[PDB]
Amino acid sequence: DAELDQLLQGHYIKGYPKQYTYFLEDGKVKVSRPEGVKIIPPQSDRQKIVLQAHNLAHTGREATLLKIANLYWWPNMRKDVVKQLGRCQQCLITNASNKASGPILRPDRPQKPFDKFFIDYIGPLPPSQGYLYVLVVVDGMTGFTWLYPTKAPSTSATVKSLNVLTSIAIPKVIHSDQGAAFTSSTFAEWAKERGIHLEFSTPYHPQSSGKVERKNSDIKRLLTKLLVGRPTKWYDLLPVVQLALNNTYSPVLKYTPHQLLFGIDSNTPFANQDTLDLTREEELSLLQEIRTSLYHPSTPPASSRSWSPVVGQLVQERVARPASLRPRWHKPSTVLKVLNPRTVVILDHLGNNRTVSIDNLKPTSHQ
Amino acid sequence: DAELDQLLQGHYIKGYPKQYTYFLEDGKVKVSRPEGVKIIPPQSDRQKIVLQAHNLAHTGREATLLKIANLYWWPNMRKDVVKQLGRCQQCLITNASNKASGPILRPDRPQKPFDKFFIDYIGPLPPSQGYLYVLVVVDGMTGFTWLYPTKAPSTSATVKSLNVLTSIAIPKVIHSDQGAAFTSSTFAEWAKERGIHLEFSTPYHPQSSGKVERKNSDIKRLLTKLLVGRPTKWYDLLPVVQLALNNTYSPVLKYTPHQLLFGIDSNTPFANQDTLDLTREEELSLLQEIRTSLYHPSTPPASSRSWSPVVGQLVQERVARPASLRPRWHKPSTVLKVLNPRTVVILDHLGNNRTVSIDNLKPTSHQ
Amino acid sequence: DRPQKPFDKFFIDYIGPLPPSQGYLYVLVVVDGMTGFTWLYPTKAPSTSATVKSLNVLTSIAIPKVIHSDQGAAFTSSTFAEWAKERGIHLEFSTPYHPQSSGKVERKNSDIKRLLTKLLVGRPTKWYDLLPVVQLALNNTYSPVLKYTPHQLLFGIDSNTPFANQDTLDLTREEELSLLQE
Amino acid sequence: DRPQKPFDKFFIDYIGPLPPSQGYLYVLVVVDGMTGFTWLYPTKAPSTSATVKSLNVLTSIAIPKVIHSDQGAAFTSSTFAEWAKERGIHLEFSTPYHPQSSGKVERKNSDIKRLLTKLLVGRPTKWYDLLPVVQLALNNTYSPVLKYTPHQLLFGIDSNTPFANQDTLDLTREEELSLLQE
DNA sequence: TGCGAAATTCCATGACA
DNA sequence: ATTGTCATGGAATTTCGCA
DNA sequence: TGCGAAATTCCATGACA
DNA sequence: ATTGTCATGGAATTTCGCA
Numbered sequence A, B: 001d002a003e004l005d006q007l008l009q010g011h012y013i014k015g016y017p018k019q020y021t022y023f024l025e026d027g028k029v030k031v032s033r034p035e036g037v038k039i040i041p042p043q044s045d046r047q048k049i050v051l052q053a054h055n056l057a058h059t060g061r062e063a064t065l066l067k068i069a070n071l072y073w074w075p076n077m078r079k080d081v082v083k084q085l086g087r088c089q090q091c092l093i094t095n096a097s098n099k100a101s102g103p104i105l106r107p108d109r110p111q112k113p114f115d116k117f118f119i120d121y122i123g124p125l126p127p128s129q130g131y132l133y134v135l136v137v138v139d140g141m142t143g144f145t146w147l148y149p150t151k152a153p154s155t156s157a158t159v160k161s162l163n164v165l166t167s168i169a170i171p172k173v174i175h176s177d178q179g180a181a182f183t184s185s186t187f188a189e190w191a192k193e194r195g196i197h198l199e200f201s202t203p204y205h206p207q208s209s210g211k212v213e214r215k216n217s218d219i220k221r222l223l224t225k226l227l228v229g230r231p232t233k234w235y236d237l238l239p240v241v242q243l244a245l246n247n248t249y250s251p252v253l254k255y256t257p258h259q260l261l262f263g264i265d266s267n268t269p270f271a272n273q274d275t276l277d278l279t280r281e282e283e284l285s286l287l288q289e290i291r292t293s294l295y296h297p298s299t300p301p302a303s304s305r306s307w308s309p310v311v312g313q314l315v316q317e318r319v320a321r322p323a324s325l326r327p328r329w330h331k332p333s334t335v336l337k338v339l340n341p342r343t344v345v346i347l348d349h350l351g352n353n354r355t356v357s358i359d360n361l362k363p364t365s366h367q
Numbered sequence C, D: 001d002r003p004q005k006p007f008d009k010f011f012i013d014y015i016g017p018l019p020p021s022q023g024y025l026y027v028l029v030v031v032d033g034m035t036g037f038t039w040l041y042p043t044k045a046p047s048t049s050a051t052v053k054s055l056n057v058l059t060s061i062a063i064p065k066v067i068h069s070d071q072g073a074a075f076t077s078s079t080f081a082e083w084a085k086e087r088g089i090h091l092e093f094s095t096p097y098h099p100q101s102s103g104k105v106e107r108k109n110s111d112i113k114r115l116l117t118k119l120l121v122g123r124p125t126k127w128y129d130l131l132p133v134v135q136l137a138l139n140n141t142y143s144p145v146l147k148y149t150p151h152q153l154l155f156g157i158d159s160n161t162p163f164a165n166q167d168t169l170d171l172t173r174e175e176e177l178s179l180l181q182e
Numbered sequence E, G: 001t002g003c004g005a006a007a008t009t010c011c012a013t014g015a016c017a
Numbered sequence F, H: 001a002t003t004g005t006c007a008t009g010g011a012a013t014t015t016c017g018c019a
């Protein structure tokens, strides 16, 4: 009222351009703008107007302004619109993001065999000999894979299988997702007794176990081919598939996982015989050079509209299993620490510290 | 034998380079190559060798050759390898494609309202007033949407809802996916009685109904926002959501679906009043110009490794619901006709003619 | 003064009681004043509840500035007044025993009553299923004054169902005998 | 002549019958000739079936060129010969009553028999669970001749479980009294 | 004839089972 | 016999208010 | 010192619930 | 407190056989 009063008599007010005529009509301050005559509401009514227009269909910036512009005008309207969008809890937790995650990391290949195992379960598969699942264990450095059929993705089945595997060697680190078989206290005690450090993917991010996931693809692809035109009796094929994949060349590496593990082929078809005249010591010397000269990929280019996390930034975690007609995002949380450009610790929506992947985060819009 | 015989005595044979020495040892023709001494098998044994090496793990071109190269050499080995890869039925139907589909078409917006309806079902939703599904009807030209709650995605529920809708106007064409409610003979008879042509998406390709699918997203997004912190009673919100979306501005169009349909806002909040001084005839004249000047997107750039179908090409249709450990692709079929760069008729794996999207096809590898 | 426009004024009235047709006895008639476009809603009673339920369907498509009706109890109730007030709809009533609308709306409501009568005979209990085709006929009827159909004035295009063959709209001699018997 | 290599020759033999441990009575011992690496498989019988089942696990990790054994019935059966022939494995038998292997394999099999005896006393029915730690100990044992453990010669790296404290491998006075009582 | 800022346009991102 | 679509919010671009 | 062709390398595509 | 991966087959590039 007071601000609009001096505008009616001709005094200049910052934000209101002077070249327009501000008159009164029907008890309302109006202005003749190129798009037409618009009502200038007092400052004390603009928040309610923005809220009424936005709440019609919970529209974004432009779709909300187009509604308001049909009747009203005032300085810096979109500023007030964005101010309401950032305060509408329903939009913040339901809307999608339009900013992609930063480019993926390509973490270093483990230096030695048995430095880091990646493990995961496949299944449920069609029942074969009473078995439904396959425990998959891939050595990070070599890609050498062990297959164990199980009746359940349970801790007890994991421990039994790994007790057999660890008869050959004990790994430094075992990496796995946060499935129930690997997060139980029983499995943690099993690893501590053997000096094995357990490493866990961020939740709901199978990329982090990509080493084994990618092997799972090859396992099921070969099983599918061998089972064409036959009933899905896969139990007896696991040893075949294990041996077949462990002696398959990687075209970019020029070596098989067996070769990276032992430095010499065993009595398998088409065995390589290049080191036949070398001694075992000379063979192992060549093997050490091969392990260190393997091709390693680099981080891809960031997309044109990616975001990277910053300490103190407001971010929102993706809802794990969102119910029907329920929001896909949690309420905003704060980035406590940036472990790497793709991994952060947030002050969780429950109050806890949570280590998550930025693939399961979006930056809260409108700051 | 005969070809390898003249090679042992020093005669030149095409394909075998002359600068190498071809000798005999252990009853086998061998050659000293830079990588080492390799066995040269006779022509009559090379197919079996390629097959044995490939069948170890059903490997691709390079991974199969690396096996063969460990022991043997002969002219143009990869040529024989590719010849076997193109004949291995298990690989052709199980392997993935590495050639993307051609760029998407952006078909013309229908010229007039009621020229083409797009219809689809949403659900099952949480039970609200005994209802589980929502029939969605979007006019192609305007985007104006009608919402009907149903207890099942059935033909009877579709006919009842469309009999109410068609009280206002009859559309030329109704487009829908191949769901059961829209493909029944009862629904076909219903449309023929009213002069409505039924148009069907290619199977398993919701992109083709993208007009309604995109509206389904907005419908569920607004329902989610309105139901935050409340039980999911969505039945009474359908009329609200319908009105709210039909009067929401599209930022790229600068108009609401209601405006594109009627040329004037009804008594809704923030109604536009720009044509208040025009007559209805002048209003409808401006509306006709607006309908013809709407922004239309163009075909995006093709990706660097896309494929486009050609008449007579061997292609494979994606398996609809592939069972566990079963191939993801059907046996090769032939392209009969190219309706458009993204749609073809194939001689189906059952012997029938099938109109499919190239998104559900891959080109058969190795010709 | 501003030229007349669609959604400026909706004229509403009840037709009935009719013979039962799938449990419905009345028809709520809604006519847009400017275009003459007609919406028909079957109800079981000429009550406020039935009126609000039917108009909630229509007002989820378009909201009028003014609703006009006579002094019927369904329209003058405090509940219906609150319903209109919640939607920003002004209610306008004609003087008791002096129904007043417009020439176009008067003639349109005449056509509706006559078209229903012509199709009631022979099948008086099957009018619920015929309501869609009745509205299409009414809304694609050429207007001598405006020289456009209601469909054309409302959507600004031609229709896909142009009604060129007009029903006689007068009962044939055999239709009159069957109506006197009923 | 070509230098000796891993997988050139696997030496196999049965140890047993042992006290029952979770239903198993025998141990199939497999030793790689070049590295001395040891695999232990518990079986319920020294039969061809039990041998094929255990070696199918091992031969899904690595296949030897030659398998060496004595003239035991499980190893000289026509079924086991067909099994080896299907995998391209040549079977090599020692002369009856004249067991012949290598100094490294002889001493390795001596260590296995002694290490098992030292851990059998006090818990003669719990050796099934101890088979993993037994192989780790054997395969991470320093070789005086080759100056490398079997683990080092097989994988070309150091191990994450280096066994620095050697068991006495000789029964203590109290362990001898408990073994005589059993 | 040019400046700083507001307003408009652009468009990558992601979801419709 | 058929075919993706478009709300969203930071960024890039254009226009505006003034001189 | 250069040519045609074979061989090798490159790398976008897609799937691991 | 953690992090994508790699077989695949046309295409692009390099090497080979010969002069």
Ligand SMILES: COC(=O)CNc1c(C(=O)NCc2ccc(F)cc2F)c(=O)n(O)c2ncccc12
Pocket: A120, A121, A177, A178, A179, A204, A205, A206, A207, A210, A213, G016, G017
């Ligand atoms: C995105 O999917 C998820 O949120 C997690 N799903 C699992 C997946 C999963 O979704 N795998 C698919 C998949 C998607 C993207 C990738 F980059 C890798 C994958 F394996 C999984 O492979 N395993 O082993 C799981 N194990 C336990 C619990 C969940 C999963």
Ligand SMILES: COC(=O)CNc1c(C(=O)NCc2ccc(F)cc2F)c(=O)n(O)c2ncccc12
Pocket: B120, B121, B177, B178, B179, B204, B205, B206, B207, B210, B213, E016, E017
């Ligand atoms: C790829 O998913 C399919 O094969 C088809 N699924 C359906 C989908 C579906 O998968 N929708 C998701 C979806 C994915 C990609 C798109 F470009 C649009 C979509 F709606 C659907 O929306 N409707 O309505 C269906 N109706 C009947 C039968 C199937 C669907």
Ligand SMILES: [Mg+2]
Pocket: A120, A121, A177, A179
């Ligand atoms: Mg998992």
Ligand SMILES: [Mg+2]
Pocket: A120, A121, A206, A209, A213, A216
């Ligand atoms: Mg997995």
Ligand SMILES: [Mg+2]
Pocket: B120, B121, B177, B179
């Ligand atoms: Mg559908």
Ligand SMILES: [Mg+2]
Pocket: B120, B121, B206, B209, B213, B216
């Ligand atoms: Mg759909």
Ligand SMILES: [Mg+2]
Pocket: C012, C013, C014, C069, C070, C071, C072
């Ligand atoms: Mg009345």
Ligand SMILES: [Mg+2]
Pocket: D012, D013, D014, D069, D070, D071, D072
């Ligand atoms: Mg023996």
Ligand SMILES: [Zn+2]
Pocket: A054, A058, A059, A088, A089, A090, A091
């Ligand atoms: Zn909102």
Ligand SMILES: [Zn+2]
Pocket: B054, B058, B059, B088, B089, B090, B091
């Ligand atoms: Zn194959």
